[PDB]
mmCIF file of all heavy atoms in Angstrom:
data_model
loop_
_atom_site.group_PDB
_atom_site.id
_atom_site.type_symbol
_atom_site.label_atom_id
_atom_site.label_comp_id
_atom_site.label_asym_id
_atom_site.label_seq_id
_atom_site.Cartn_x
_atom_site.Cartn_y
_atom_site.Cartn_z
ATOM 1 N N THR A 1 -9.022 1.595 19.461
ATOM 2 C CA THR A 1 -10.066 2.094 20.393
ATOM 3 C C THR A 1 -10.714 3.315 19.750
ATOM 4 O O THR A 1 -10.033 4.234 19.308
ATOM 5 C CB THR A 1 -9.496 2.472 21.726
ATOM 6 O OG1 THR A 1 -8.676 1.435 22.226
ATOM 7 C CG2 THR A 1 -10.619 2.719 22.692
ATOM 8 N N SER A 2 -12.013 3.274 19.628
ATOM 9 C CA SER A 2 -12.774 4.357 19.019
ATOM 10 C C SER A 2 -13.841 4.849 19.977
ATOM 11 O O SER A 2 -14.509 4.086 20.632
ATOM 12 C CB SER A 2 -13.402 3.878 17.753
ATOM 13 O OG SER A 2 -14.689 3.352 17.992
ATOM 14 N N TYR A 3 -13.937 6.172 20.023
ATOM 15 C CA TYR A 3 -14.955 6.850 20.858
ATOM 16 C C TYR A 3 -16.335 6.670 20.298
ATOM 17 O O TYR A 3 -16.497 6.394 19.101
ATOM 18 C CB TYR A 3 -14.554 8.301 21.003
ATOM 19 C CG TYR A 3 -15.349 9.136 21.916
ATOM 20 C CD1 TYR A 3 -15.364 8.853 23.306
ATOM 21 C CD2 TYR A 3 -16.070 10.253 21.484
ATOM 22 C CE1 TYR A 3 -16.136 9.598 24.179
ATOM 23 C CE2 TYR A 3 -16.842 11.024 22.350
ATOM 24 C CZ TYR A 3 -16.840 10.724 23.674
ATOM 25 O OH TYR A 3 -17.585 11.457 24.533
ATOM 26 N N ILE A 4 -17.366 6.812 21.149
ATOM 27 C CA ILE A 4 -18.777 6.823 20.721
ATOM 28 C C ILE A 4 -19.305 8.142 21.134
ATOM 29 O O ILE A 4 -19.468 8.439 22.341
ATOM 30 C CB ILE A 4 -19.561 5.675 21.322
ATOM 31 C CG1 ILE A 4 -18.806 4.356 21.163
ATOM 32 C CG2 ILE A 4 -20.884 5.543 20.626
ATOM 33 C CD1 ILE A 4 -19.442 3.213 21.864
ATOM 34 N N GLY A 5 -19.679 8.989 20.211
ATOM 35 C CA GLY A 5 -20.225 10.296 20.520
ATOM 36 C C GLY A 5 -21.696 10.197 20.912
ATOM 37 O O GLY A 5 -22.265 9.122 21.018
ATOM 38 N N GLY A 6 -22.285 11.345 21.154
ATOM 39 C CA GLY A 6 -23.641 11.386 21.494
ATOM 40 C C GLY A 6 -23.952 10.950 22.933
ATOM 41 O O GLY A 6 -23.039 10.707 23.733
ATOM 42 N N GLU A 7 -25.252 10.827 23.200
ATOM 43 C CA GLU A 7 -25.690 10.362 24.494
ATOM 44 C C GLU A 7 -26.393 9.036 24.299
ATOM 45 O O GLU A 7 -27.515 8.969 23.792
ATOM 46 C CB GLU A 7 -26.632 11.388 25.134
ATOM 47 C CG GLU A 7 -25.950 12.620 25.579
ATOM 48 C CD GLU A 7 -26.901 13.716 26.028
ATOM 49 O OE1 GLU A 7 -27.922 13.889 25.334
ATOM 50 O OE2 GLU A 7 -26.626 14.373 27.048
ATOM 51 N N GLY A 8 -25.776 7.915 24.701
ATOM 52 C CA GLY A 8 -26.362 6.603 24.656
ATOM 53 C C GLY A 8 -26.217 5.999 23.285
ATOM 54 O O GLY A 8 -26.331 6.693 22.241
ATOM 55 N N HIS A 9 -26.059 4.685 23.212
ATOM 56 C CA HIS A 9 -25.896 3.976 22.016
ATOM 57 C C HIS A 9 -26.601 2.667 22.064
ATOM 58 O O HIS A 9 -27.372 2.417 22.972
ATOM 59 C CB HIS A 9 -24.430 3.836 21.650
ATOM 60 C CG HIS A 9 -23.603 3.433 22.843
ATOM 61 N ND1 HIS A 9 -23.759 2.225 23.500
ATOM 62 C CD2 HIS A 9 -22.588 4.093 23.454
ATOM 63 C CE1 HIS A 9 -22.884 2.198 24.498
ATOM 64 N NE2 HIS A 9 -22.207 3.273 24.527
ATOM 65 N N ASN A 10 -26.298 1.796 21.121
ATOM 66 C CA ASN A 10 -26.870 0.462 21.061
ATOM 67 C C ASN A 10 -25.778 -0.624 20.893
ATOM 68 O O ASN A 10 -26.073 -1.766 20.605
ATOM 69 C CB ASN A 10 -27.855 0.337 19.906
ATOM 70 C CG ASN A 10 -27.336 0.910 18.652
ATOM 71 O OD1 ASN A 10 -27.136 2.120 18.556
ATOM 72 N ND2 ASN A 10 -27.014 0.058 17.695
ATOM 73 N N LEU A 11 -24.530 -0.239 21.042
ATOM 74 C CA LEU A 11 -23.374 -1.068 20.633
ATOM 75 C C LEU A 11 -23.100 -2.148 21.648
ATOM 76 O O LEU A 11 -23.263 -1.928 22.891
ATOM 77 C CB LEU A 11 -22.126 -0.183 20.449
ATOM 78 C CG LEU A 11 -21.905 0.461 19.122
ATOM 79 C CD1 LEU A 11 -22.808 1.650 18.863
ATOM 80 C CD2 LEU A 11 -20.435 0.923 19.085
ATOM 81 N N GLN A 12 -22.689 -3.294 21.211
ATOM 82 C CA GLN A 12 -22.379 -4.438 22.069
ATOM 83 C C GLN A 12 -21.252 -5.212 21.361
ATOM 84 O O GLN A 12 -20.578 -4.719 20.486
ATOM 85 C CB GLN A 12 -23.597 -5.238 22.348
ATOM 86 C CG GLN A 12 -24.292 -5.816 21.172
ATOM 87 C CD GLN A 12 -25.821 -5.828 21.305
ATOM 88 O OE1 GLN A 12 -26.371 -5.235 22.212
ATOM 89 N NE2 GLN A 12 -26.474 -6.598 20.456
ATOM 90 N N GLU A 13 -21.092 -6.435 21.825
ATOM 91 C CA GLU A 13 -20.194 -7.399 21.140
ATOM 92 C C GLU A 13 -20.723 -7.625 19.765
ATOM 93 O O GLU A 13 -21.888 -7.669 19.483
ATOM 94 C CB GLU A 13 -20.215 -8.763 21.913
ATOM 95 C CG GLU A 13 -18.958 -9.565 21.773
ATOM 96 C CD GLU A 13 -17.804 -9.128 22.663
ATOM 97 O OE1 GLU A 13 -17.939 -8.111 23.345
ATOM 98 O OE2 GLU A 13 -16.709 -9.740 22.549
ATOM 99 N N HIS A 14 -19.758 -7.787 18.801
ATOM 100 C CA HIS A 14 -19.996 -8.231 17.455
ATOM 101 C C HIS A 14 -20.924 -7.343 16.619
ATOM 102 O O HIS A 14 -21.746 -7.832 15.864
ATOM 103 C CB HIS A 14 -20.537 -9.679 17.450
ATOM 104 C CG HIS A 14 -19.622 -10.650 18.156
ATOM 105 N ND1 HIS A 14 -18.312 -10.368 18.420
ATOM 106 C CD2 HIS A 14 -19.907 -11.898 18.646
ATOM 107 C CE1 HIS A 14 -17.793 -11.442 19.061
ATOM 108 N NE2 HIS A 14 -18.721 -12.340 19.195
ATOM 109 N N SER A 15 -20.768 -6.018 16.785
ATOM 110 C CA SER A 15 -21.512 -5.051 15.954
ATOM 111 C C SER A 15 -20.581 -4.402 15.009
ATOM 112 O O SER A 15 -19.401 -4.168 15.305
ATOM 113 C CB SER A 15 -22.151 -4.025 16.876
ATOM 114 O OG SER A 15 -23.136 -4.568 17.725
ATOM 115 N N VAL A 16 -21.053 -4.079 13.799
ATOM 116 C CA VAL A 16 -20.241 -3.682 12.702
ATOM 117 C C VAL A 16 -20.443 -2.148 12.519
ATOM 118 O O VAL A 16 -21.433 -1.697 11.970
ATOM 119 C CB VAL A 16 -20.594 -4.374 11.405
ATOM 120 C CG1 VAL A 16 -19.494 -4.208 10.401
ATOM 121 C CG2 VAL A 16 -20.807 -5.888 11.726
ATOM 122 N N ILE A 17 -19.443 -1.398 13.011
ATOM 123 C CA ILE A 17 -19.515 0.044 13.062
ATOM 124 C C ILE A 17 -18.573 0.627 11.983
ATOM 125 O O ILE A 17 -17.751 -0.086 11.423
ATOM 126 C CB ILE A 17 -19.170 0.580 14.451
ATOM 127 C CG1 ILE A 17 -17.743 0.154 14.732
ATOM 128 C CG2 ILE A 17 -20.081 -0.002 15.437
ATOM 129 C CD1 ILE A 17 -17.182 0.677 15.989
ATOM 130 N N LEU A 18 -18.635 1.939 11.850
ATOM 131 C CA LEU A 18 -17.859 2.665 10.818
ATOM 132 C C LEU A 18 -17.049 3.779 11.535
ATOM 133 O O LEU A 18 -17.641 4.779 11.909
ATOM 134 C CB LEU A 18 -18.741 3.230 9.770
ATOM 135 C CG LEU A 18 -18.127 3.742 8.471
ATOM 136 C CD1 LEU A 18 -17.478 2.683 7.719
ATOM 137 C CD2 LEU A 18 -19.218 4.407 7.670
ATOM 138 N N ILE A 19 -15.771 3.543 11.763
ATOM 139 C CA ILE A 19 -14.928 4.544 12.439
ATOM 140 C C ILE A 19 -14.428 5.592 11.414
ATOM 141 O O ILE A 19 -14.362 5.287 10.230
ATOM 142 C CB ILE A 19 -13.788 3.915 13.202
ATOM 143 C CG1 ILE A 19 -12.708 3.405 12.268
ATOM 144 C CG2 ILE A 19 -14.290 2.785 14.073
ATOM 145 C CD1 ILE A 19 -11.341 3.462 12.832
ATOM 146 N N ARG A 20 -14.081 6.723 11.917
ATOM 147 C CA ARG A 20 -14.075 7.958 11.101
ATOM 148 C C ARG A 20 -12.776 8.732 11.190
ATOM 149 O O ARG A 20 -12.317 9.304 10.231
ATOM 150 C CB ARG A 20 -15.217 8.843 11.639
ATOM 151 C CG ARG A 20 -15.397 10.103 10.803
ATOM 152 C CD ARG A 20 -16.340 11.048 11.517
ATOM 153 N NE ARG A 20 -15.727 11.678 12.695
ATOM 154 C CZ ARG A 20 -16.431 12.253 13.647
ATOM 155 N NH1 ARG A 20 -17.748 12.300 13.572
ATOM 156 N NH2 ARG A 20 -15.780 12.813 14.674
ATOM 157 N N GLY A 21 -12.082 8.696 12.369
ATOM 158 C CA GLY A 21 -10.901 9.474 12.491
ATOM 159 C C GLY A 21 -11.176 10.741 13.239
ATOM 160 O O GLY A 21 -12.289 11.313 13.116
ATOM 161 N N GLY A 22 -10.231 11.240 13.995
ATOM 162 C CA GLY A 22 -10.435 12.343 14.874
ATOM 163 C C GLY A 22 -10.268 11.954 16.336
ATOM 164 O O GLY A 22 -11.114 11.295 16.903
ATOM 165 N N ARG A 23 -9.151 12.382 16.907
ATOM 166 C CA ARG A 23 -8.809 12.032 18.293
ATOM 167 C C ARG A 23 -9.605 12.789 19.302
ATOM 168 O O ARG A 23 -9.634 14.056 19.237
ATOM 169 C CB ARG A 23 -7.302 12.211 18.494
ATOM 170 C CG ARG A 23 -6.908 12.154 19.935
ATOM 171 C CD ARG A 23 -5.496 12.702 20.093
ATOM 172 N NE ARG A 23 -5.448 14.162 19.961
ATOM 173 C CZ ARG A 23 -5.174 14.972 20.973
ATOM 174 N NH1 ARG A 23 -4.961 14.481 22.209
ATOM 175 N NH2 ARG A 23 -5.170 16.267 20.805
ATOM 176 N N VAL A 24 -10.207 12.100 20.256
ATOM 177 C CA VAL A 24 -10.724 12.762 21.458
ATOM 178 C C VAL A 24 -9.577 12.996 22.400
ATOM 179 O O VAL A 24 -8.813 12.061 22.723
ATOM 180 C CB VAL A 24 -11.881 11.906 22.034
ATOM 181 C CG1 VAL A 24 -11.536 10.478 22.045
ATOM 182 C CG2 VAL A 24 -12.197 12.334 23.455
ATOM 183 N N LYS A 25 -9.483 14.246 22.896
ATOM 184 C CA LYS A 25 -8.215 14.698 23.430
ATOM 185 C C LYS A 25 -7.850 14.103 24.779
ATOM 186 O O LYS A 25 -6.794 13.599 25.021
ATOM 187 C CB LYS A 25 -8.171 16.213 23.512
ATOM 188 C CG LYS A 25 -6.920 16.788 24.070
ATOM 189 C CD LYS A 25 -6.948 18.273 24.081
ATOM 190 C CE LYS A 25 -5.804 18.793 24.879
ATOM 191 N NZ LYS A 25 -5.946 18.530 26.386
ATOM 192 N N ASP A 26 -8.829 14.149 25.712
ATOM 193 C CA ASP A 26 -8.547 13.756 27.072
ATOM 194 C C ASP A 26 -8.637 12.208 27.318
ATOM 195 O O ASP A 26 -8.450 11.793 28.442
ATOM 196 C CB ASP A 26 -9.486 14.468 28.060
ATOM 197 C CG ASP A 26 -10.914 14.199 27.804
ATOM 198 O OD1 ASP A 26 -11.250 13.647 26.732
ATOM 199 O OD2 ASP A 26 -11.756 14.544 28.623
#
């Protein structure tokens, strides 16, 4: 499970993203 920063995105099913590392605490 990876967080999405910022305000609003375009992500959906079957999108190729690049995860980075860094735990969101809560």
Side-chain angles (χ1 to χ4, degrees):
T1 310
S2 89
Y3 187 61
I4 313 173
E7 291 171 318
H9 42 63
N10 47 292
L11 273 74
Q12 58 214 16
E13 208 78 2
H14 303 342
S15 296
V16 195
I17 61 176
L18 191 66
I19 73 149
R20 185 191 73 198
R23 167 194 73 111
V24 45
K25 179 178 168 292
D26 59 347

